[PDB]
Amino acid sequence: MKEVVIASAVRTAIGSYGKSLKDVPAVDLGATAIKEAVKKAGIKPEDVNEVILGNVLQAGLGQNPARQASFKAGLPVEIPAMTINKVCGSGLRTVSLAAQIIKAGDADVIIAGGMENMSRAPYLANNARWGYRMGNAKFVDEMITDGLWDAFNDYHMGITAENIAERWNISREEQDEFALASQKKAEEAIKSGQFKDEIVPVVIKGRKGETVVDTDEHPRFGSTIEGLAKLKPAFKKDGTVTAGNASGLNDCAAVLVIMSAEKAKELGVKPLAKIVSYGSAGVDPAIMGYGPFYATKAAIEKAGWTVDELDLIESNEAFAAQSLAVAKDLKFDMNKVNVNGGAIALGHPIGASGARILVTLVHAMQKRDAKKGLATLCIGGGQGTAILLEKC
Amino acid sequence: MKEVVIASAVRTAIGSYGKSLKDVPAVDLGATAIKEAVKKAGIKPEDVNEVILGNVLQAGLGQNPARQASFKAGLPVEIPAMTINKVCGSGLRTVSLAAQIIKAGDADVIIAGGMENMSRAPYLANNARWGYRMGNAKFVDEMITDGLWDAFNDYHMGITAENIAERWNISREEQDEFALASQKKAEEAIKSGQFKDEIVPVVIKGRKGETVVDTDEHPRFGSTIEGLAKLKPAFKKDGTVTAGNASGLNDCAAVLVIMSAEKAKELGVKPLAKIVSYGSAGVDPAIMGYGPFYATKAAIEKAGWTVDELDLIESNEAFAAQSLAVAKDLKFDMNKVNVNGGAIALGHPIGASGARILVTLVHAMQKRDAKKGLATLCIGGGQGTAILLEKC
Amino acid sequence: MKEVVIASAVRTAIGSYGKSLKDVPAVDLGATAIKEAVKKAGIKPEDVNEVILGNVLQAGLGQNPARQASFKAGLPVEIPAMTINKVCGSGLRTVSLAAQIIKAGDADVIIAGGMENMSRAPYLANNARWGYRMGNAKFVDEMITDGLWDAFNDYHMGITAENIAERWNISREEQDEFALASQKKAEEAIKSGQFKDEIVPVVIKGRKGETVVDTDEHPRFGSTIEGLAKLKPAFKKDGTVTAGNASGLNDCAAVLVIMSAEKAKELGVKPLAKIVSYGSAGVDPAIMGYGPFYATKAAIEKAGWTVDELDLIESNEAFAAQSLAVAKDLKFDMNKVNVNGGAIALGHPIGASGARILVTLVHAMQKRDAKKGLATLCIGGGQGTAILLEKC
Amino acid sequence: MKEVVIASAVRTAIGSYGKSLKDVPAVDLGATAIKEAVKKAGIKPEDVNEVILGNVLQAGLGQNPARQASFKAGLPVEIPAMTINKVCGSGLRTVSLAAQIIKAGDADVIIAGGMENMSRAPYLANNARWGYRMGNAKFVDEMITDGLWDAFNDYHMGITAENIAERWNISREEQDEFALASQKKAEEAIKSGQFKDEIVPVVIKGRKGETVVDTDEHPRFGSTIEGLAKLKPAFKKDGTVTAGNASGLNDCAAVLVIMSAEKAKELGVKPLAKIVSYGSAGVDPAIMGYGPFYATKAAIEKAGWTVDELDLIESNEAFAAQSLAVAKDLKFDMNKVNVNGGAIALGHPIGASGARILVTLVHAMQKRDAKKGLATLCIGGGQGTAILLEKC
């Protein structure tokens, strides 16, 4: 049916926990990235049919955080919006949902992506409404419960990363060397201007003064292998995962204008890339056949491609252990992966992260003249999200 | 373009605030409804491609409440699931999203609907993470902030209902007669068994016994116009809107199995109705040229129908003043509206309500042999959500 | 050295946890008791020199709860007031402090006693001011932390009672027979009007009506040994202490007017009893040479009395195991102990309880014409508090 | 009756809000000052008969904060202890209570004073136990509610200071010049070693490292009149009270060993001063006669003295407005007042403050060879606390 393209792809800088964006609600980050994505695509806000934004920690953000972002961006109040939560998947799954609505014939132009401000997550009192009656109870970290805690196994995401490291023998040393390379690559990318096209500044009107945040602050410049080897395991006595080889808690928004090829032509848009296939795409049989990261595998097959044919790959770094497991199984050429650094250095703003790596992927393909790109994040049946792009 | 149908449609009873469902998390109500929906459709859990569920008060409910409901229902862990939040529109928007995904060629069978437990919403401390420093602060009722408060105008949704009552000149008396009619129709429908097919019982297993909840708790049997006339305004001094002419705060899950017509035939399923059109369908020029209830007008127009041709209508009753404004503008025959009672009597479990009225519409169409049906809820630019159904 | 007397002695009923006094702040119970105590003593508010009141759960009750009670009772704003917290000892220690101030020549008329509303204790967030940073934390039940938890051993006061039961070899059976006897005596005392003189009614004025609370709510009329024998241990697996052989969590105020004998004569007051001695009286060599209940032994010795000479004894029943250990060690004649029932039946409103048993002792001495009385409560080094009274 | 003396007088440094002592609970500060007061008096911990300590913000501190301090100090577990709360009065009123118990013949040696850690005060949820039911509620700053908020007038203490400034015409300029002089005098006192005798270091065992806090940190060295004139009013639009001319929120403990003259002789103690009279002393008539600070006035008269005869005076600086009002009315010679600086510079750790200024007074009398001293704090009938000392 319709071909689907990315007309623009914009993100804020990624802030560190409790730092540069602590005072900027997720919805304002979202609004900042939407306003700019719309200008960068060269379309009018009224050309937009629907807004679809991921956001995981919605607690106390008020009704329909995606709608607030749309309205704050200056989009027409009558554009419908919805907020999606698939945890790790949210921000990228909104892009494939956009492509699906366009394919169904119901839209031509959709704002997609995601936003998160983990620094601002609340604490919760779950039994304040009808009473605790008696006894100490839990004052709930909402960021941990709704974003980072495995609802079924009743342990932290970090434990899952340990399990994978264990089962595959991904050693502490191997994870730290991977973390070091992500740090070095982010530092070079930032210092060489590789993110200048994709970052929209955020303006914080301070008590008096305006502050501009326009640079990713999470990378630890000058990281060394020695510095990483000294860190204590963060999740498990004598484990392999540390602060050093895992991503952080971060704040960002990242937004893309998704359009039918035919509408892009009509509006004089010069698109950046075509969406070729995605993890959600087509149906079955059979699911289990490909192995444990079958989402990404099957998405690659549906595009008619192989891993060797890919020019650039964004494979999210929630934990180095998980990144190394995926790269090993799919036999990625590591020179083509996370070329501007990955989440260990840059940050993992949950609900925005899938969209963030797609924004970094599309600009890197443009910059480096790379024809075939893969963005992939999250691990395990039901959860993997992946998109394949072919540059225009 | 694939034809899309409803293979089953099931809901829990709707509980009242702090009452029959207070001890049953939204995800468990959702799991109960999904497990039954699959059984009623006569399909296996393995036949489901994806789970898409409305839920507005997600705070503290843990990662991806839709995925939790899916898992707790017995559905394969590999089925992808996402949680959607469009406030009032959430539960019906998941049904049209299901149809779009099916139309795009990406799934054949999708569990859609919504779940909410307003009785269990937390309170929040928004500045607990980095500190309050000094001075009293707000202990935030999350149900009001995330479900009921207009994020822009900074007032209760009740105030919007009051403005609509003034706008359309709808009197206190008119609102209470409408409320009384919803109450009477709900009482007669309950007592005549009109909900017996669609309600799945919820079994609450305590430390000492079992309680079965299978009847809608919210209606006030024996309501009278004098009883309604004595009520104090809920939202403002000298207001027209009271607790007796507005819906409540309520707990429910409502799930439908949505399939392509082709898969339904292949699986031996006898579908209940075909989804003919929805407010999201086709693109937006010139959408605001119809009036303020243009999502609903545009959906009816896209079906190729008119209001006079409709046999049954479910038009949600968040507030009698809103229900009457939509009914006057669209010139509904009120004999065909909310024939088994509406949300004033039955309750408004936010992220489930749009699916709950679809579940009620489709069962009522079957029972009454009505060919053409409309479900509509929410009011205002870009919020209205509507679906048109044609009985099989 | 001035002689010191009790001119009046009044208490509210004792409410049960979350029940009859849940809506009445401790300071209001205190104000009700003070206003009546002054009236019963036949003195004017102007005749009071100082207000000294026990209150253990002061959190959030506002500045100087004793001063608030004093003011709300009609006492001149210039009367100095202080709030004392010695946990279990608070309410009786204020009576001996009153006597010391009178003996020192610094006052002639002091309002003493205690007030507590355990039903209204808050929960706490201890790190809200400077932040929790990350991770779940304790939402602290302040009643347990400030009123019931051993700050050193880091366990419930219930565990101390269990250790005392083991120490003194006091069986489950023995504790329940003692509890049943407290229940029976309380039921007979209530029904025979033994508390009618000492209880001041509390009038709760709602938005729509008035409720009068004037009867002790906590006793379980018709208790049986079989009913007690079926109870599960409260504090530890296979424990002897249950909810049926330990006191409750309760709400009360109890106030006495304490005067020099000289002022009482000057004001025309007929005093109820003379305070002969108290556990604080004279200095400490060699205080621990008596046993573990040496405050009580030493008070009796300072009166120039013995246990056999006492006519009535109020020995508080926080736990049956503690009550029985004190009674065995001191060889009390149990026919003279807690003759109108004790705290198992009647409740243990912490910072009021010591004054409440003094109020009950002095009324019982009057009614029964008993010359010599002992009130004792609390156990362990430096906590025990006791007063000896001689009827006028 | 018995003469009463101060055998030793010790305090911690006073920390600023959220600063040097933020990690040291009030009870540990108390314990540190008790252990040292006992050594400085040259008596054994077993010579102590009772512990009486002021502490206003007791919320969540656990049972009987004075007892915890005693136990943590290494005092015998059987010494009875009680915590007093008279807000501003607490710490000094414990010293006069000590003298009263000694006068009554019931003790020879008492530990008195007070402790507070305002940085550590909790936030409160007052309706967590039985439920908020619905609607936003207040997340309570316990420090403000229990320490700084006028329970009767329902406004901040700062408003009272404004009222006094208003009624007496104590101008902004006059208050800032008073604040400047307190700042200069504290700076000279600290730099000249005047507090070295009375400060006991506090040792904070850090993550690794021990930190020593031994210097008052609140003074703003180098303050200037210009700096103070630039500040905005803190309580009232166009008011006179600012951060600059008011004290802070501070953390400290200050403890004194109080003994009978006869026991000091017997134990070979060389006392520092005799307590001559106190605000609580003797009884009436008539109270209103002296004017609004009659507490202090009457205490001065009872010693047989006049204001002119005083050699040194500590008059607390909660707010410069209140200090200037008292000094004007009693016609203090300002050269003899707060000679080492006052609370504006040094801090006002509520429950400790009365004891802190008595500790500073007694050491200053020793240092400067001053025979007659007055300590006074708090304002308004019922609340004024005052003690007169005559040096040994």
Query: What is the three-state SS of A113-136?
Result: EEEEEHHHCCEEECCCCCCCCCCC
Contacts of B130 in chain C (CB under 8 A): 131, 133
Q: What are phi and psi of D81, to 5 degrees?
A: -140, 150
Task: State the Cα–Cα distance between residues C56 and C143, nearest whole angstrom.
Answer: 9
Buried b (16+ CB within 10 A) or exposed e, D77-97: ebbbbbbbbbbbbbbbbbbbb
- The residues of C annotated with a catalytic role in the active site are 88, 348, 378
Amino acid identity, position D189: A
The token pair at A327 is 């790269």
Active-site residue identified among B156, B348, B363, B392? B348
Amino acid identity, position B391: K
Which of D1, D47, D124, D149 to substitute to test the interface with C, most C CBs within 10 Å? D124
C131/B129 CB distance under 8 A:
yes
D131/A134 CB distance under 8 A:
no
Which of C58, C88, C111, C133 to substitute to test the interface with D, most D CBs within 10 Å? C58
Which of C123, C133, C136, C140 to substitute to test the interface with B, most B CBs within 10 Å? C133
Task: State the Cα–Cα distance between residues D360 and D340, nearest whole angstrom.
Answer: 8
| A61, A80, A126 ranked by CB distance to B60: nearest | A126
Nearest to B322 by CA among B298, B348, B356: B348
Q: Rounded to the nearest 5 degrees, what angle is found at the Cα of C13, between the Cα atoms of C7 and C19?
A: 155
Nearest to C172 by CA among C245, C120, C80, C262: C245
A146/B77 CB distance under 8 A:
no
B283/A107 CB distance under 8 A:
yes
Cis amide prior to D286 (ω within 30 degrees) = yes
The token pair at A112 is 């997609």
Say which residue the tokens 């997550």 belong to: A121
| C61, C128, C146 ranked by CB distance to D62: nearest | C146
Q: CA nearest B118 in D: which residue?
A: D134
At CB < 8 Å, which residues of chain A contact C?
17-18, 123, 125, 132-141, 143-145, 249
Beta pairing, strands C50-54 & C81-85 = parallel
The token pair at A105 is 């014939």
Strand partners of residue B178: none
The token pair at A75 is 């989009």
Which spans in chain A are helix H? 26-41, 65-72, 90-103, 142-143, 157-168, 172-191, 225-229, 261-266, 294-302, 320-330, 343-346, 350-368
Q: What are phi and psi of C140, to 5 degrees?
A: -90, 130
D212 CB-contact burial (10 Å; exposed 0-12 / middle 13-18 / buried 19+): exposed
Are B342 and B313 within 8 A, CB to CB?
A: no
The token pair at C20 is 């009859």
Active-site residue identified among B88, B218, B252, B363? B88
How far is residue C158 from each of residues B57, C243, C247, D134, measured CA to CA in Å? 39, 10, 10, 35
A129/D133 CB distance under 8 A:
yes
Say which residue the tokens 């225009």 belong to: A392
The token pair at B34 is 């999904």
The subunits that touch chain B, with at least 3 C-beta pairs less than 8 Å apart, are A, C, D
Q: Quick check: helix, strand or coil at residue A310? A: coil
Contacts of B140 in chain D (CB under 8 A): 136
Contacts of D17 in chain B (CB under 8 A): 134
Are A353 and A253 within 8 A, CB to CB?
A: no
Are B71 and B144 within 8 A, CB to CB?
A: no
Strand partners of residue B254: B11, B114
Contacts of D263 (CB under 8 A, 6+ apart): D108, D109, D269
The token pair at B321 is 């003043």
B150/A77 CB distance under 8 A:
no
Task: State the Cα–Cα distance between residues B379 and B168, nearest whole angstrom.
Answer: 14
Say which residue the tokens 């759960």 belong to: C57
Strand partners of residue B314: B375
Side-chain half-sphere CA neighbours of C109 within 13 A: 25
Nearest to C318 by CA among C285, C356, C283: C356
Task: State the Cα–Cα distance between residues C371 and C221, nearest whole angstrom.
Answer: 31
For chain C, what is the HEC assignment? Answer: CCCEEEEEEEECCCEECCCCCCCCCHHHHHHHHHHHHHHHHCCCHHHCCEEEEECCCCCCCCCCHHHHHHHHCCCCCCCCEEEEECHHHHHHHHHHHHHHHHHCCCCCEEEEEEEEEHHHCCEEECCCCCCCCCCCEEEEEHHHHHHHEECCCCEEHHHHHHHHHHHCCCCHHHHHHHHHHHHHHHHHHHHCCCCCCCECCEEEECCCCEEEECCCCCCCCCCCHHHHHCCCECCCCCCCCEHHHECCCEEEEEEEEEEEHHHHHHHCCCCCEEEEEECCCCCCCCHHHHCCCHHHHHHHHHCCCCHHHCCEEEECCCEHHHHHHHHHHHCCCHHHECCCCCHHHHCCCHHHHHHHHHHHHHHHHHHHCCCEEEEEECCCCCCCEEEEEEEC
Are A56 and A147 within 8 A, CB to CB?
A: yes
Q: Rounded to the nearest 5 degrees, what angle is found at the Cα of B212, between the Cα atoms of B210 and B213?
A: 140
Q: Give kind and range of the element (H or E) at residue A110.
A: strand A109-117
Solved by what technique? X-ray
DSSP state, D220? Answer: -
Nearest to A27 by CA among A272, A289, A298, A352: A352
Which residue segments constitute the domains of chain B, with CATH numbers given?
Answer: 1-123+194-275 (3.40.47.10), 152-193+276-389 (3.40.47.10)
Q: How far is C61 from chain B (nearest CA, A)?
A: 15
Task: State the Cα–Cα distance between residues A353 and A357, nearest whole angstrom.
Answer: 6
Are A271 and A261 within 8 A, CB to CB?
A: yes
Task: State the Cα–Cα distance between residues C96 and C112, nearest whole angstrom.
Answer: 9
Q: CA nearest B132 in C: which residue?
A: C129
Task: State the Cα–Cα distance between residues D132 and D140, nearest whole angstrom.
Answer: 14
C104/D107 CB distance under 8 A:
no
The beta-strand segments (E) located in chain D are 4-11, 15-16, 50-54, 81-85, 109-117, 123-125, 137-141, 149-150, 155-156, 202-205, 210-213, 250-260, 273-278, 312-315, 372-377, 385-391
Q: Give kind and range of the element (H or E) at residue A140.
A: strand A137-141
**Interface size, chain A vs chain C, as Cβ–Cβ contacts under 8 Å:** 50
D301 CB-contact burial (10 Å; exposed 0-12 / middle 13-18 / buried 19+): middle
Q: What are phi and psi of D109, to 5 degrees?
A: -140, 120
Are C135 and C278 within 8 A, CB to CB?
A: no
Q: CA nearest C4 in D: which residue?
A: D104
Task: State the Cα–Cα distance between residues D61 and C246, nearest whole angstrom.
Answer: 25
Contacts of B222 (CB under 8 A, 6+ apart): B187
| Residues in chain D, overall count | 392
Amino acid identity, position C131: G
Strand partners of residue D386: D376
Contacts of B219 (CB under 8 A, 6+ apart): B183, B186, B187, B190, B341, B345, B346
Contacts of A304 (CB under 8 A, 6+ apart): none
Q: How far is D130 from chain A (nearest CA, A)?
A: 4
Contacts of A17 in chain C (CB under 8 A): 134
Q: What are phi and psi of D266, to 5 degrees?
A: -55, -40
Task: State the Cα–Cα distance between residues C234 and C241, nearest whole angstrom.
Answer: 6
Contacts of B59 in chain A (CB under 8 A): 58-60, 122, 124, 142, 146
Question: Catalytic: D88?
Answer: yes
Nearest to A29 by CA among A77, A65, A62: A65
Q: How far is C145 from chain A (nearest CA, A)?
A: 9
Contacts of A227 (CB under 8 A, 6+ apart): A220, A244
DSSP state, A12? Answer: P
Task: State the Cα–Cα distance between residues A299 and A276, nearest whole angstrom.
Answer: 9
